[model samples]
Target: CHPCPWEWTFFQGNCYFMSNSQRNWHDSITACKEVGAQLVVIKSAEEQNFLQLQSSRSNRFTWMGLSDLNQEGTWQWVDGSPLLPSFKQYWNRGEPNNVGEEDCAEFSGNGWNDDKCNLAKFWICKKSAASC
Candidate 1:
């Protein structure tokens, strides 16, 4: 049997939920948790590529499980993990400029961009797929 739940995309042992509804960053995180998932976290360039394509294919800006809300300039995943150097490179050239006092990360223009956490945007959820 396929390891992932129905309607979720499975890749590399993880399941992704490309959301249809738009929500602000914190609310998106809450929604993901309601379904036993978390906002998608790109751990590597490979994962970033995969996720970026997924969002583009589905169409539009999607939030990552990342933010610098706790401390400006200090980003971390929803699970409170830091970004790897490889993962860090996913940001668009000279992004996270504190533009609009941005604290959340989202997929935009083929790369990550920091944006205001209050802006409503599509978000992706991710969870470990069950072993078959």
Candidate 2:
């Protein structure tokens, strides 16, 4: 686990896997669980930077482990952490506006954007590395 599984990427103390194909947010969650990981929870700029850089080449939108499904306007990560403004705002200009009733979050440009949850998009899986 320390080295991470084949094809999965490693950074800091966690391992991350990017889906090769696209899926809706619900399907993406199940896909990650099958791999013994959960959707990535980006809590800091460092984490966001790593993902942004890694995904820049692809230039494709990737769903993040974030949503306001339970309660609109109140976003939370898969880890159950609140999206506090104090943490660092990364949403693009006028984003999270819930356009077309968007409630899911995805990588967009240099930041994150809200989109309809049912749309197909690749996603990232994450889990902590084993301490050796």
Candidate 3:
């Protein structure tokens, strides 16, 4: 059975919720937690393609579950998986430059960027559809 709520999108075995309102990365994570999900984590090119298409439709930057906050050079997903070297990471040119303590990741245009986590931005949340 389809498990997604009316407003959420189901793909594979997961349900995704893209936020219309802006929130800081920490706040966004908290918001997702309140709904029993976590910030969206890209596990494949297919997932990235889905999110990229969604971002194209929104015309706004969207935060994801990926961040390097715990250690500056080591990026990991909210679920604690280290980014795989073989995975397609859509980083914008010169992104994750870690400019001025930028530690959080966000998607804009067709790629990802590292930015200060406190800046408010739209976000995406995800969870197993069966759990939604």
Candidate 4:
């Protein structure tokens, strides 16, 4: 059997929770942690595409597990891996301008964008699927 909960989506051996409730970046991660999950981490184009489609349905920017908080201009996933160059290219033009001191990443309408960590936004959480 798959590991996803009743209302969660299952994909590529992971269970995803696309939340409609808005919260700040840190709080969002906390919420996911409380649920035994973490912010969704997009490790492949396929996963990114899937998330894009899901975000499109809600028409809202969804927080991802990416941030450059520890060191400006050095983005890393919550799992502590550096953001890949290919994934970096997914950012929308003129993004990550540090506008309003933005440091967190989110799925924008067309691509990803950097926004302030304190801003409220919907989020996606993910966890590995457990063995049957």
Off by over 4 Å in 1: 57-59
Q: Model 4: residues >4 Å from true position, as ranges?
A: none
Q: Among all windows of ten consecutive residues in candidate 3, which has the lowest summed lDDT?
A: 86-95
Best by TM-score: 4
Candidates by TM-score, descending order: 4, 1, 2, 3
Cα lDDT tens digits for candidate 4, 1-132: 758887899898899998969999999999999999999888899999999877776689889999999999998999999999888778889887888788999999878899999999999999988888
Point out where model 2 deviates above 4 Å. Answer: none
So what's the TM-score on candidate 3? Answer: 0.93
How do the residues 99-121 of candidate 1 rate in per-residue lDDT, one tens digit apiece?
Answer: 87999999986788999999999
- Candidate 4: the clashing residue pairs are none
In angstroms, the error of model 1 at 115 is 0.3
60 Cα displacement, candidate 3 (Å): 0.7
Q: Give the per-residue Cα lDDT of candidate 4 at 53.
A: 79
Each prediction's TM-score against the native?
Answer: 0.94, 0.93, 0.93, 0.95
lDDT of the structure predicted as candidate 4:
0.90
Model 1 per-residue lDDT at 45:
63
Clashes of 4: 0
Candidate 4: residue 4 lDDT (0-100): 86
lDDT score at residue 55, model 2, on the 0-100 scale = 61
Ranking by lDDT: 4, 3, 1, 2
Q: Single out the weakest 10-residue window by summed lDDT for candidate 4.
A: 52-61
Give per-residue CA lDDT, model 2, range 11-123, as digits (tens): 99888998889999989988989988998888677988888765666888999899999999999988898998864478888888998899999987777899999999989
